[PDB]
Design an enzyme around this catalytic site. Structure first.
Site, PDB file in Angstrom:
ATOM      1  N   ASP A  57       0.839  -1.112  -0.222  1.00  0.00           N
ATOM      2  CA  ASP A  57       0.043   0.037   0.073  1.00  0.00           C
ATOM      3  C   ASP A  57       0.887   1.215  -0.206  1.00  0.00           C
ATOM      4  O   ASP A  57       2.011   1.318   0.662  1.00  0.00           O
ATOM      5  CB  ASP A  57      -0.865  -0.121   1.117  1.00  0.00           C
ATOM      6  CG  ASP A  57      -1.845   1.048   1.256  1.00  0.00           C
ATOM      7  OD1 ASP A  57      -2.868   1.126   0.775  1.00  0.00           O
ATOM      8  OD2 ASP A  57      -1.526   2.224   2.017  1.00  0.00           O
ATOM      9  N   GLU A 143     -10.683 -21.079  12.409  1.00  0.00           N
ATOM     10  CA  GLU A 143      -9.765 -21.691  11.242  1.00  0.00           C
ATOM     11  C   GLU A 143      -8.274 -21.847  11.832  1.00  0.00           C
ATOM     12  O   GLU A 143      -7.830 -22.914  11.854  1.00  0.00           O
ATOM     13  CB  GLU A 143     -10.011 -20.895  10.054  1.00  0.00           C
ATOM     14  CG  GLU A 143     -11.371 -21.220   8.982  1.00  0.00           C
ATOM     15  CD  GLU A 143     -11.495 -22.705   8.645  1.00  0.00           C
ATOM     16  OE1 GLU A 143     -10.372 -23.390   8.580  1.00  0.00           O
ATOM     17  OE2 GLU A 143     -12.630 -23.078   9.025  1.00  0.00           O
ATOM     18  N   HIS A 146      -8.033 -24.874  13.847  1.00  0.00           N
ATOM     19  CA  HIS A 146      -7.727 -26.034  13.349  1.00  0.00           C
ATOM     20  C   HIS A 146      -6.190 -26.367  13.530  1.00  0.00           C
ATOM     21  O   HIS A 146      -5.730 -27.262  13.453  1.00  0.00           O
ATOM     22  CB  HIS A 146      -8.300 -26.137  11.944  1.00  0.00           C
ATOM     23  CG  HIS A 146      -9.763 -26.555  12.096  1.00  0.00           C
ATOM     24  ND1 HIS A 146     -10.332 -27.315  12.481  1.00  0.00           N
ATOM     25  CD2 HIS A 146     -10.900 -25.847  11.157  1.00  0.00           C
ATOM     26  CE1 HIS A 146     -11.781 -27.371  12.388  1.00  0.00           C
ATOM     27  NE2 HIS A 146     -11.743 -26.434  11.502  1.00  0.00           N
ATOM     28  N   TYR A 157     -10.866 -35.542  10.807  1.00  0.00           N
ATOM     29  CA  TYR A 157     -11.869 -34.760  10.222  1.00  0.00           C
ATOM     30  C   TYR A 157     -12.982 -35.610   9.863  1.00  0.00           C
ATOM     31  O   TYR A 157     -13.634 -35.365   8.809  1.00  0.00           O
ATOM     32  CB  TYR A 157     -11.081 -33.769   9.356  1.00  0.00           C
ATOM     33  CG  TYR A 157     -10.197 -32.546   9.722  1.00  0.00           C
ATOM     34  CD1 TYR A 157      -8.914 -32.646   9.946  1.00  0.00           C
ATOM     35  CD2 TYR A 157     -10.802 -31.319   9.660  1.00  0.00           C
ATOM     36  CE1 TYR A 157      -8.165 -31.683  10.425  1.00  0.00           C
ATOM     37  CE2 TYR A 157      -9.826 -30.195  10.293  1.00  0.00           C
ATOM     38  CZ  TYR A 157      -8.592 -30.470  10.375  1.00  0.00           C
ATOM     39  OH  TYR A 157      -7.756 -29.256  10.743  1.00  0.00           O
ATOM     40  N   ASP A 185     -20.686 -13.028  21.127  1.00  0.00           N
ATOM     41  CA  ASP A 185     -21.993 -13.949  21.327  1.00  0.00           C
ATOM     42  C   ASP A 185     -21.467 -15.344  21.028  1.00  0.00           C
ATOM     43  O   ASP A 185     -20.254 -15.606  21.112  1.00  0.00           O
ATOM     44  CB  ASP A 185     -22.955 -13.427  20.204  1.00  0.00           C
ATOM     45  CG  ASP A 185     -22.240 -13.361  18.566  1.00  0.00           C
ATOM     46  OD1 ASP A 185     -21.916 -14.671  18.187  1.00  0.00           O
ATOM     47  OD2 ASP A 185     -21.901 -12.355  18.304  1.00  0.00           O
ATOM     48  N   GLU A 190     -21.826 -14.838  12.424  1.00  0.00           N
ATOM     49  CA  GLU A 190     -22.763 -13.839  12.309  1.00  0.00           C
ATOM     50  C   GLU A 190     -22.530 -12.552  11.525  1.00  0.00           C
ATOM     51  O   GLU A 190     -23.424 -11.907  11.051  1.00  0.00           O
ATOM     52  CB  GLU A 190     -23.437 -13.685  13.733  1.00  0.00           C
ATOM     53  CG  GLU A 190     -22.567 -12.854  14.563  1.00  0.00           C
ATOM     54  CD  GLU A 190     -21.403 -13.432  15.468  1.00  0.00           C
ATOM     55  OE1 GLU A 190     -21.631 -14.892  15.185  1.00  0.00           O
ATOM     56  OE2 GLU A 190     -20.516 -13.086  15.810  1.00  0.00           O
ATOM     57  N   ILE A 197     -29.947 -10.585   6.019  1.00  0.00           N
ATOM     58  CA  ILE A 197     -30.670 -10.985   6.909  1.00  0.00           C
ATOM     59  C   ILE A 197     -30.201 -10.762   8.370  1.00  0.00           C
ATOM     60  O   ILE A 197     -28.736 -11.187   8.700  1.00  0.00           O
ATOM     61  CB  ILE A 197     -30.924 -12.586   6.904  1.00  0.00           C
ATOM     62  CG1 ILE A 197     -31.464 -13.057   5.336  1.00  0.00           C
ATOM     63  CG2 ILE A 197     -31.853 -12.961   8.084  1.00  0.00           C
ATOM     64  CD1 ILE A 197     -31.699 -14.241   5.045  1.00  0.00           C
ATOM     65  N   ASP A 226     -20.853 -34.529   4.857  1.00  0.00           N
ATOM     66  CA  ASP A 226     -20.300 -33.633   5.784  1.00  0.00           C
ATOM     67  C   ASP A 226     -19.227 -34.284   6.503  1.00  0.00           C
ATOM     68  O   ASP A 226     -19.206 -34.175   7.746  1.00  0.00           O
ATOM     69  CB  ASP A 226     -21.224 -32.653   6.668  1.00  0.00           C
ATOM     70  CG  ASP A 226     -20.443 -31.637   7.350  1.00  0.00           C
ATOM     71  OD1 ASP A 226     -19.548 -31.080   6.837  1.00  0.00           O
ATOM     72  OD2 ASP A 226     -21.098 -31.212   8.511  1.00  0.00           O
ATOM     73  N   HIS A 231     -19.706 -30.692  10.917  1.00  0.00           N
ATOM     74  CA  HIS A 231     -20.350 -29.314  11.411  1.00  0.00           C
ATOM     75  C   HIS A 231     -21.990 -29.324  11.946  1.00  0.00           C
ATOM     76  O   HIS A 231     -22.214 -28.410  12.382  1.00  0.00           O
ATOM     77  CB  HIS A 231     -20.391 -28.455  10.263  1.00  0.00           C
ATOM     78  CG  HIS A 231     -19.262 -28.279   9.509  1.00  0.00           C
ATOM     79  ND1 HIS A 231     -18.514 -28.724   8.594  1.00  0.00           N
ATOM     80  CD2 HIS A 231     -18.114 -26.995   9.802  1.00  0.00           C
ATOM     81  CE1 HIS A 231     -17.456 -28.263   8.155  1.00  0.00           C
ATOM     82  NE2 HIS A 231     -17.211 -27.252   8.782  1.00  0.00           N
TER      83      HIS A 231
HETATM   84  O1  LIG Z   1     -27.911 -16.863  23.198  1.00  0.00           O
HETATM   85  C1  LIG Z   1     -28.030 -15.902  24.293  1.00  0.00           C
HETATM   86  C2  LIG Z   1     -26.760 -16.172  24.995  1.00  0.00           C
HETATM   87  O2  LIG Z   1     -25.746 -15.135  24.072  1.00  0.00           O
HETATM   88  C3  LIG Z   1     -26.628 -15.474  26.304  1.00  0.00           C
HETATM   89  O3  LIG Z   1     -25.475 -15.935  27.115  1.00  0.00           O
HETATM   90  O4  LIG Z   1     -27.817 -15.865  27.219  1.00  0.00           O
HETATM   91  C4  LIG Z   1     -28.999 -15.757  26.632  1.00  0.00           C
HETATM   92  C5  LIG Z   1     -29.133 -16.550  25.035  1.00  0.00           C
HETATM   93  O5  LIG Z   1     -30.167 -16.260  24.430  1.00  0.00           O
HETATM   94 CA   LIG Z   2     -26.889 -12.404   8.350  1.00  0.00          CA
HETATM   95 CA   LIG Z   3     -19.847 -15.476  16.789  1.00  0.00          CA
HETATM   96 CA   LIG Z   4      -3.834   3.154   0.784  1.00  0.00          CA
HETATM   97 ZN   LIG Z   5     -20.626 -11.760  17.347  1.00  0.00          ZN
HETATM   98 ZN   LIG Z   6     -13.808 -25.935  11.218  1.00  0.00          ZN
HETATM   99 ZN   LIG Z   7     -13.688 -24.369   8.118  1.00  0.00          ZN
HETATM  100 ZN   LIG Z   8     -15.808 -26.216   8.218  1.00  0.00          ZN
END
Ligand SMILES: O[C@@H]1[C@@H](O)[C@H](O)OC[C@H]1O
Ligand SMILES: [Ca+2]
Ligand SMILES: [Ca+2]
Ligand SMILES: [Ca+2]
Ligand SMILES: [Zn+2]
Ligand SMILES: [Zn+2]
Ligand SMILES: [Zn+2]
Ligand SMILES: [Zn+2]
Ligand SMILES: O[C@@H]1[C@@H](O)[C@H](O)OC[C@H]1O
Ligand SMILES: O[C@@H]1[C@@H](O)[C@H](O)OC[C@H]1O
Ligand SMILES: O[C@@H]1[C@@H](O)[C@H](O)OC[C@H]1O
Ligand SMILES: O[C@@H]1[C@@H](O)[C@H](O)OC[C@H]1O
Ligand SMILES: O[C@@H]1[C@@H](O)[C@H](O)OC[C@H]1O
Ligand SMILES: O[C@@H]1[C@@H](O)[C@H](O)OC[C@H]1O
Ligand SMILES: O[C@@H]1[C@@H](O)[C@H](O)OC[C@H]1O
Length: 316
Positions: A57, A143, A146, A157, A185, A190, A197, A226, A231
């Site tokens: 860069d 990853e 692993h 695996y 979480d 996520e 979504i 799988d 998984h």
């Molecule tokens: O997924 C949630 C979790 O993160 C939390 O620890 O307790 C409530 C759950 O619904």
């Molecule tokens: Ca999403």
């Molecule tokens: Ca997460």
């Molecule tokens: Ca740059």
């Molecule tokens: Zn998160």
């Molecule tokens: Zn994995």
């Molecule tokens: Zn993977």
């Molecule tokens: Zn995987």
């Protein structure tokens, strides 16, 4: 490359600003000399040749859209390094400060990320199922874990050993996400899954059944897809880990939660000292019990909670 250690700034896949460790020699390179033998991030330039070019860069500023996957691969490799070093006294994935190399912009529309035995590889996603997968710290740390497993227990695996392998990566991916403590979480992926979504993920550790994964040994998948459901059946172990940390009552079994740090110490010791390539769920329970016994004593709450959690998911 040889050069001066510098600190650049940029934005990641999700638009957040962060500082990155770079190396300056005419250009600023995504080469972090502050961690072990270095963290190096590469541009695969939409091809599948690896690693590609060490990321260069002109101005040490990484705010272009094209820069974002590299910023996050580089930064989250550093967080994962910091987690394993500060929390478990483990220097990089092999415990001997191996360089951590990552390539981004791998192929086109590629909805995956993987440790390939010597480096991390990140697709950009197709923009519908995934956005660039290095945007998920739990994906990055899953990853890289692993590699930790490969250099320790060597869990295969497939079948139950493979589901343990997957769960171990989900557990430490999540503990790294909490260690970074930005938006943690008990969900996996996520941040980068389905940008259209909100509120979903690839799988849930707190409630695997939300996405049709088993939360009890009696519901384990026994088919051939799988690699024998690695998984899918990881949900049984993920649920046990969630219970060990957070507590709860599951199929009528009450588990006293002992928190995230002790969950991590117990499973890290199980992985590095007791698991073997073909460990099954019952042997993982035994390893976790023995690990908690080593760390906390046979009469401890920690041991009792490990037993409760595995009872709750039907693993004897
Ligand atoms: O997924 C949630 C979790 O993160 C939390 O620890 O307790 C409530 C759950 O619904
Ligand atoms: Ca999403
Ligand atoms: Ca997460
Ligand atoms: Ca740059
Ligand atoms: Zn998160
Ligand atoms: Zn994995
Ligand atoms: Zn993977
Ligand atoms: Zn995987
Ligand atoms: O460029 C140098 C790097 O190659 C070395 O490993 O440690 C110091 C850096 O400045
Ligand atoms: O919104 C993000 C932007 O801030 C970053 O610069 O490039 C990637 C985008 O996803
Ligand atoms: O949240 C966890 C923290 O409590 C512990 O100290 O180390 C691991 C982290 O994930
Ligand atoms: O109730 C869940 C259902 O909504 C989903 O479709 O498949 C798995 C079940 O756990
Ligand atoms: O046999 C199992 C039972 O012990 C538990 O309560 O829930 C699931 C069943 O398969
Ligand atoms: O069929 C396998 C089953 O026997 C085991 O219990 O879990 C993994 C599956 O692949
Ligand atoms: O079989 C293993 C046993 O040898 C050890 O004591 O704890 C881990 C178990 O899985």
């Amino acid at each position: 490359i040889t050069g001066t250690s510098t600190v650049g700034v940029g934005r990641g896949v999700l638009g957040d600003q962060k500082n990155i460790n770079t190396t300056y020699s005419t250009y600023y390179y995504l080469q972090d000399n502050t961690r072990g033998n270095g963290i190096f991030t590469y541009d695969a330039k939409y091809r599948t040749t690896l690693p590609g070019s060490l990321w260069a860069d002109a101005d040490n500023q990484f705010f272009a859209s094209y820069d974002a996957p590299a910023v996050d691969a580089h930064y989250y490799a550093g967080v994962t390094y910091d987690y394993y070093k500060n929390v478990h006294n483990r220097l990089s994935y092999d415990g001997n400060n191996a360089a951590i190399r990552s390539s981004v912009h791998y192929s086109q529309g590629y909805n995956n990320a993987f440790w390939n035995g010597s480096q991390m590889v990140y697709g950009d996603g197709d923009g519908q199922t995934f956005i660039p997968l290095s945007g998920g710290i739990d994906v990055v740390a899953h990853e890289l874990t692993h590699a930790v497993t490969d250099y320790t227990a060597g869990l295969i695996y497939q079948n139950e050993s493979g589901a343990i392998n997957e769960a171990i990566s989900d557990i430490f991916g999540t503990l790294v996400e909490f260690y970074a403590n930005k938006n943690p979480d008990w969900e996996i992926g996520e941040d980068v899954y389905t940008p259209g979504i909100s509120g979903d993920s690839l799988r849930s550790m707190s409630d695997p059944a939300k996405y049709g994964d088993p939360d009890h040994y009696s519901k384990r998948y026994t088919g051939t897809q799988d690699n024998g459901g690695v998984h899918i059946n990881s949900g049984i172990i993920n649920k046990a880990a969630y219970l060990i940390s957070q507590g709860g009552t599951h199929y009528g079994v009450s588990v006293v939660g002992i928190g995230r740090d002790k969950l991590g110490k117990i499973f890290y010791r199980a992985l590095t000292q007791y698991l073997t390539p073909t460990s099954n769920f019952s042997q993982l329970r035994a390893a976790a019990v023995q690990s908690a016994t080593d760390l906390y004593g046979s009469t401890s709450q920690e041991v009792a909670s490990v037993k409760q959690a595995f009872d709750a998911v039907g693993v004897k």
